């Protein structure tokens, strides 16, 4: 197509674009609240944690790093947050 609008893409085709190739840059990662089934405090964990995060008090461990998104241990509920 010739008269393709470059100013206004729909969010469908803007989400699939590469993080650096968007109209304006925006990371694909996020933060989230991870609560152990045992304790009561909620910790903030990066999606791509890149480190082994464990809850304070030496109760259990929270996430295991991988090559992409970090994977959470069994039973740990998470909810992402916005601002």
């Amino acid at each position: 197509p010739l008269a393709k609008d470059l100013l206004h893409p729909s969010p469908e085709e803007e989400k699939r674009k590469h993080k650096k190739k968007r109209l304006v840059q925006s990371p694909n990662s996020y933060f989230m609240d991870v609560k152990c089934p045992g304790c009561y405090k909620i910790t903030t964990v990066f999606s791509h944690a890149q480190t082994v995060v464990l809850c304070v008090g030496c109760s259990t461990v929270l996430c295991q790093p991988t090559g992409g998104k970090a994977r959470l241990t069994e039973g740990c509920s998470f909810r992402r947050k916005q601002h």
Binding site: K19, S26, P27, F31, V45, F46
Partner: protein, 149 residues
Amino acid sequence: GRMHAPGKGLSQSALPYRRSVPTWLKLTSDDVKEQIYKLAKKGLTPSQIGVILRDSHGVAQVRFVTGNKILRILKSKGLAPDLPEDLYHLIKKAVAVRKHLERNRKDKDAKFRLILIESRIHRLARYYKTKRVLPPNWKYESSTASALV
């Protein structure tokens, strides 16, 4: 492209447009930096000080919560290293490779790499000397590099 490789990669970090502290983050600037100081006392380069802050504490970029970057915080307190950490890791790597070569000498490929690490040191060494962070007499010696890890 890479300085010493034929690859042309694109993987890198993308800062979001918004540069304000999030509303859910309650840790404040004055009590951010003393956590940085104690993590530096454990012994940690500023590269990995910020890594374990944005996954365990929710502080994305200290330059936004605090008024300055991590290395500026450390040096204003007096905990900056003797030599820059990026230059340090080149020297540590060159020592490891050079030690591998004395054990086995037919490793022609390993010898070829040693020029590439050493070339990167000298290119990086003259940069820091123009910025007056290393003394004008600072020279990289392969024999005595092992002592300073």
